[PDB]
Every structure is written in C-alpha cells, then in structure tokens.
C-alpha cells in the first residue's frame, strides 16, 4: 500500500527546490533510489551515485547521508 509519508517529502522537496530547471536530475535521483530499494544495488552504490549526482552542493549530500536508513 505504502501510505506512511511524513518526513520523507522533507529532503525530496529540498532537492526539487535547488534543481527546478533540470528535471533530469530529479528523475535520476528517483530511479537510483528505486534501484537501491529493489535490492538491485548495494549501500556504497546508492551513496556513491548520489554523491556524484550533487557535485558542488555539499548540502544535499550531507542531507541524504543523514537520511540513510539504519544499516
């Protein structure tokens, strides 16, 4: 069902704010996240991809880092 959404749309919103001219960036972030949740990739995979995704903005990087689930 998936209906538990409260602090999930917190970081995503920030990403959409800093990037509104390039819809390819946001769509790319969503795809990567879906791949990780699908057990398709590993932890270092999603972390590395997101890290390179936001090259120049350490804000979004640190945000996703502290947003990572308990491993």
From Swiss-Prot:
Glycyl lysine isopeptide (Lys-Gly) (interchain with G-Cter in SUMO2) cross-link, chain position(s): 4, 16
Identify the residues that the record assigns to the PAH domain, covering every copy.
1-71
Chain positions covered by the region annotation Interaction with HCFC1 = 1-71
State the function annotated in the UniProt record. Acts as a transcriptional repressor. Corepressor for REST. Interacts with MXI1 to repress MYC responsive genes and antagonize MYC oncogenic activities. Also interacts with MXD1-MAX heterodimers to repress transcription by tethering SIN3A to DNA. Acts cooperatively with OGT to repress transcription in parallel with histone deacetylation. Involved in the control of the circadian rhythms. Required for the transcriptional repression of circadian target genes, such as PER1, mediated by the large PER complex through histone deacetylation.
For this entry, the protein name equals Paired amphipathic helix protein Sin3a
Provide the protein's localization: Nucleus; Nucleus, Nucleolus
**Post-translation changes:** SUMO1 sumoylated by TOPORS. Probably desumoylated by SENP2.
| Top-level lineage group | Eukaryota
> Whole protein: which stretch is covered?
119 to 189 of 1274
| Quaternary state and interactors | Interacts with ARID4B, BRMS1L, HCFC1, HDAC1, HDAC2, MXI1, SAP30L, SAP130, SFPQ and TOPORS. Interacts with OGT (via TPRs 1-6); the interaction mediates transcriptional repression in parallel with histone deacetylase. Interacts with BAZ2A, MXD1, MXD3, MXD4, MBD2, DACH1, NCOR1, NR4A2, REST, RLIM, SAP30, SETDB1, SMYD2, and SUDS3. Interacts with PHF12 in a complex composed of HDAC1, PHF12 and SAP30. Interacts with TET1; the interaction recruits SIN3A to gene promoters. The large PER complex involved in the histone deacetylation is composed of at least HDAC1, PER2, SFPQ and SIN3A.
Q: Any phenotype upon disruption?
A: SIN3A knockdown causes a significant decrease in the amount of cortical progenitors in the proliferative zone at the peak of neurogenesis, and results in altered neuronal identity and aberrant corticocortical projections.
Expression sites by tissue: Widely expressed. Highest levels in testis, lung and thymus. Expressed at relatively high levels throughout brain development. In adult mice, expression is high in neurogenic regions such as the subventricular zone, rostral migratory stream, olfactory bulb and dentate gyrus.
């Amino acid at each position: 069902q998936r209906l538990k959404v409260e602090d999930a749309l917190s970081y995503l919103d920030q990403v959409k704010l800093q990037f509104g001219s390039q819809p390819q960036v946001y769509n790319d972030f969503l795809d990567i996240m879906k791949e990780f949740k699908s057990q398709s990739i590993d932890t270092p995979g999603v972390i590395s991809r997101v890290s390179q995704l936001f090259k120049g903005h350490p804000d979004l990087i640190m945000g996703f880092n502290t947003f990572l689930p308990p491993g």
